[PDB]
Amino acid sequence: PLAKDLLHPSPEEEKRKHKKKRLVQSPNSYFMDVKCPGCYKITTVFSHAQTVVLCVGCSTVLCQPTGGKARLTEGCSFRRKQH
Amino acid sequence: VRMNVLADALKSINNAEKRGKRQVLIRPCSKVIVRFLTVMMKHGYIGEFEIIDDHRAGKIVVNLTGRLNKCGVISPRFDVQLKDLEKWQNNLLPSRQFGFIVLTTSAGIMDHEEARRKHTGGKILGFFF
Amino acid sequence: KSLESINSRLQLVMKSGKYVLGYKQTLKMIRQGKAKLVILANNCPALRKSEIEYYAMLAKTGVHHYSGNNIELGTACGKYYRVCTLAIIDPGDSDIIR
Amino acid sequence: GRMHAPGKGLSQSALPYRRSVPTWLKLTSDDVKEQIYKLAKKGLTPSQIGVILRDSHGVAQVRFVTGNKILRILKSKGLAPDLPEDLYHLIKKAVAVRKHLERNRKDKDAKFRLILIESRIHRLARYYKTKRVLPPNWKYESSTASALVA
Amino acid sequence: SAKIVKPNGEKPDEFESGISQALLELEMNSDLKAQLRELNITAAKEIEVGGGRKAIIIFVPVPQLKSFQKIQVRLVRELEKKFSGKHVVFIAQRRILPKPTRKKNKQKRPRSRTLTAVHDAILEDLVFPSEIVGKRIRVKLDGSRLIKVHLDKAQQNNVEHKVETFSGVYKKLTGKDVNFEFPEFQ
C-alpha cells in the first residue's frame, strides 16, 4: 500500500507496535493499587516491578519479580491508575 | 552510529519517492532538516510536511507529491564560494533550466539562485531535482 | 551469596560505623564490653581463635568466622595490610540486628 | 550495537510524554528526598534507589517530582559515593574476574572477557577524568583495585 | 481606588486596579482567603477574541505559579462571575532573555530563560485544567506554521468552550497560530 496514513493510524496498530517504534513513545507498563486480604491500606506498585513488595503493616509478599511483569500473590485484588 | 541526520533523512525521502509512497516518515528531526524541507516545499517539490513533537528529537511526516527525482546530500560540508558555485552547479544539477542546490549561508539555509541573488556564499548542504 | 553479602556489609561498616582492626585492640574492646561483633579469618592461629571465642562467650558477643584469610579480610576492610581479627563497635548498616 | 559484543538489542525504557506528576501521587518533593536519604544510608546505589522508589512508593521519575536527579540530590547533601556507580561496578566485575582467573589458568575465555572489562574501565575512566569527576592522576591498577570494591 | 495586591517593577497600573479590587472584595468567600492573602498578581490584560468576546489574561510570578494552580480551578469560576461573559487564564511572567549575539559581564543564559522554553511553558500553564498529551506542528505549504495541541481528553466539561479563547490569547502574547483538539484513547 502506497497511501498508508502515517499521521493518523488507528490505536490497534499503535498498541501492537514496539514502544519505541510508535509515532510517540508510550510505555507499556502502568501503576496499580493492590489490596492484600486482611489489611486496609492500599499499596501502589509498578506493574513491571523488579523487587518483592512488602506491606509495612503485615509481613506478607504482594508481587514476585518475573521476566516481564510482577506476578501478584493469589487473593490480592488490583485496579488501574488513570488508565 | 548516525553521524549525518540530514543524510539519513534525505535518503529516506529519496527511497520512499522511488517506491511511490504517498507519505514518508523521517525519524530524527532538526532545524537543518526543517529548513531544507521548507526550501524544497517552497519550490513545490514536496507537499505539506508535519512535525510530530515528542520530548525527544521530533519526527517528520512528509507528503510526497510524486515530482521528485533525487534529493541527495553532500556529506562533507565544503566551503562554497560564489566564484566556484558554477562548478558545483554544473557538476550536481541535471541542467540549467531546473534543479536546485541548497547551501547554508550566513543569511540562512537557502538555494543557490537566491544565494547568487543576494551575493553570498557558504557551506554546501545538498541538492534536489 | 553469603560471602558477597558479608563483604558488602563489611564495606558499609567502614566509612559509616565505628570499628577496630587487630588482635590487641579487639581484646581491649571486648573486655570493655563495647564490641558487638568479632570477625576472625580462618588463617588465625588456633590458640588465638579459641581465646577470642572464650572472650566473646564471656562478653556475650557474636563471632563470625570469615571465609577468607588475613589477606582477604584486609582487602574486605578496604585496607592494604593484613587484618586477622577485628571488632565492630557499632554497625550503622544493620549488619548486627537490633 | 553493543560496545564489546555483536549484539543489536533494543530493550530500553520508553519514558512517557507526560512530564507532569501524577495526581494520585501524594508524595511531595521533600518527602521523596528523605526517602532517598534513608535509602542512601542503607548503602543503595542511585540505580537501586530509583528502582525501589518506582517499585514500592509509586513515584514514576524522581526528576519529574523533585526537579533534580537522584545523584544531584545525593551530591548536594554530600553523601554521594566517591566512585561513580558504573565505574565502581566495572571495577568490581574486573576484580571478580581476576579472582576467578588466578585459580583457572586455562580459562582463556575469562582472559578475553577480562581484557574487555578493563578496556571499558579505562574508557570510562578517561571520560570521568575529562569531566573532572575523578582526579586527573586517577589510574586503575589491577593489583590495588581489590581493596576498592566489595 | 484601593490597590493593595499588585507588585511588579513599574509603579502605575491601568485597569489592573479593577482585578485587584475584585480579588480584595473576594473576601469572606468559601475559605479561600486564608490561602490567597499570601498571593499576588503581576499584571492583567484584556484582549478581544472570537466574535464579540473578551478574555482576561492574568500575569503571575513564577515561584507562586504552583500555589496558584493548586487553587486555579476553584477561583476561575468566581472570577468569571465577577466579570460575566469573560474567560480567565493564568499565565506566569517568564522574562525572555535575548539570545547572546556577537555584539561588561553577563552570565550564561539559563535554558528556562530561552524563548522556545518560555513559549511551550506558557502554553502548558495556560490550559492547566487539561494537560498536553501531544504536540503537532504543520507547515502550511508557504512557510506558515500551525501548531496542533492534543489535550488530556480526561475532562470535556470546562475546557471545550475555551479553545477559541486559548487560541486567541496564544496568538496575542506569542504571535503564532495554535489550534486545540482532543484525541481518542491512547
Which CATH number goes with the domain that contains D99?
1.10.287.10
**Residue B45 and residue B104 in contact, taking contact as beta carbons nearer than 8 Å:** no
Same-domain pairing of D41 and D60? yes
What gap in Å lies between CA B63 and CA B68, rounded to an integer?
A: 12
Cell digits for D89?
Answer: 561496578
DSSP state of B107: T
- Tell me which residue range forms the domain holding D45: 26-80
Using an 8 Å CB-CB cutoff, list chain C residues near D100: none
Q: Residues of B at the D interface (Cβ-Cβ below 8 Å)? A: 54-55
Give the separation between CA E133 and CA E184, rounded to whole angstroms: 11
Chain D residues within 8 A of A69 when measuring between CB atoms:
none
D136 and D108 in a common domain: yes
CA of E152: which chain D residue's CA is closest? D18
| Residue D125 near residue D94, CB atoms below 8 Å | no
Residue type, C41: A
- Coil, helix or strand at residue A18: coil
- Count up the domains in chain D and report the number: 2
Q: Are residues B75 and B126 in the same domain?
A: yes
Q: Which of B31, B53, B68 is a domain's end point?
A: B68
Instruction: Answer for the pair D150, D92: CB distance below 8 angstroms, yes or no.
Output: yes
Task: Calculate the alpha carbon distances from A18 to A23, A30, A47 in Å.
Answer: 10, 16, 18
* Cβ–Cβ gap D17/A24 under 8 Å: yes
Q: Does D118 map to a domain?
A: yes
Choosing among E66, E111, E131, E135, which should be mutated to test the D contact, i.e. which has the most D CBs within 10 A?
A: E131
A14 touches chain E (CB under 8 A): yes
Beta-carbon contacts of E134 under 8 Å, excluding residues fewer than 6 positions away, are A24, B53, D17, E149, E150, E183
What CATH number has the domain bearing residue B96?
A: 3.30.1490.10
Same domain, B27 and B50: yes
> Are B81 and B124 members of one domain?
yes
Q: Which domain holds residue E139?
A: 1-186
Q: Are residues D73 and D87 in the same domain?
A: no
Q: Which residues of B touch E138 (CB under 8 A)?
A: 48, 50-51
Three cell numbers written together for C54: 572464650
Q: How many CB pairs under 8 A join A and D?
A: 49
Instruction: Give C20→chain D minimum CA distance, Å.
Output: 17
Does residue D97 lie within any of the structural domains?
Answer: yes
- State the resolution, in angstroms: 2.8
> What domain range includes position A48?
1-83
Same domain? For D38 and D101 the reply is no
User: d(Cα E79, Cα E56) in Å, to the nearest integer?
Assistant: 10
Binding site, annotated residues of A: 36, 39, 55, 58
Of the candidates B61, B2, B55, B51, which has an alpha carbon nearest to the alpha carbon of residue B30?
B51
User: What is the extent of the structural domain holding B49?
Assistant: 1-68
Query: Are D38 and D61 part of one and the same domain?
Result: yes
CB E180 within 8 A of CB E160: no
Looking up cell 504571535 gives: E175
Closest approach of chain C CAs to the CA of D29, in angstroms?
26
| B contact chains, 3+ CB pairs < 8 A | A, D, E
Which cell numbers hold the place of D136?
A: 586527573
With CB atoms and an 8 Å threshold, state whether E139 touches B42: no
Contact D10 A28 (CB under 8 A): no
Per the structure, the count of domains in chain E is 1
> Could you tell me if B73 and B119 lie in one domain?
yes
Q: Residues D89, D138: one domain?
A: yes
The residue of E141, E142, E181, E186 whose CB has the most chain B CBs within 10 angstroms, and thus the best one to mutate to test that interface, is E141
> By what technique were these coordinates determined?
cryo-EM
How many domains does the structure of chain B reveal? 2
Kindly state whether residue D87 falls inside one of the protein's structural domains.
yes
- Are B39 and B73 in the same domain? no
Which one of A24, A25, A28, A80 makes the best mutation probe of the E interface by having the most chain E beta carbons within 10 Å?
A24
Domain boundary among B23, B42, B68: B68
Number of structural domains chain A divides into: 1
SS (H, E, C) chain D: CCCCCCCCCCCCCCCCCCCCCCCCCCCCHHHHHHHHHHHHHCCCCHHHHHHHHHHCCCCCCHHHHHCCCHHHHHHHHCCCCCCCHHHHHHHHHHHHHHHHHCCCCCCHHHHHHHHHHHHHHHHHHHHHHHCCCCCCCCCCCCCHHHHHCC
D46 and D87 housed in the same domain: no
**Treating both helix axes as pointing N-terminal to C-terminal, what angle do D46-55 and D70-77 enclose, rounded to 10 degrees?**
120
What is the SS3 assignment for E105?
A: coil
Confirm if C97 and C66 have CB atoms less than 8 A apart: no
Spatial distance between the Cα atoms of C25 and D64, rounded to a whole number of angstroms = 50
Q: Are residues B93 and B64 in the same domain?
A: no
Q: Which of D78, D80, D83 is nearest to D95 (CA)?
A: D83
Q: Sort out which chain D residues have CB atoms less than 8 A from B55's CB and list them.
A: 15, 17, 19
- Rounded to whole angstroms, the Cα distance separating B62 from D22 reads 35
Q: Which residues, in sequence order, are CB contacts of A32 under 8 Å at separation 6+?
A: A44, A45, A46, A47, A78, A79, A80, A81
Among D80, D99, D115, the domain-final residue is D80
User: Any idea what DSSP says for residue E55?
Assistant: E
